[PDB]
Amino acid sequence: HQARVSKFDLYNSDKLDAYNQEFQVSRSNIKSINNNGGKYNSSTIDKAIDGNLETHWETGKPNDANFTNEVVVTFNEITNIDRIVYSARRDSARGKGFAKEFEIYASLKDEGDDFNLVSSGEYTESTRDLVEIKFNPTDFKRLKFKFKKADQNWASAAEFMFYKEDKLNEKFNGLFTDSSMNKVSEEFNTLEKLNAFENELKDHPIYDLYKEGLNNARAILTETSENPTKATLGQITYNLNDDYNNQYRMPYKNIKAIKNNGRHYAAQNIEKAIDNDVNTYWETGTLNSSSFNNEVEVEFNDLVTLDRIVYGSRQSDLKGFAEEVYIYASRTSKGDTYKLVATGAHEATKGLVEAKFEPTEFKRVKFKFKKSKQNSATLNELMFYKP
Ligand SMILES: [Ca+2]
Ligand SMILES: [Ca+2]
Question: Where does Ca(2+) 2 bind (predicted)?
Answer without folding.
Answer: 272, 275, 277, 280, 380-381
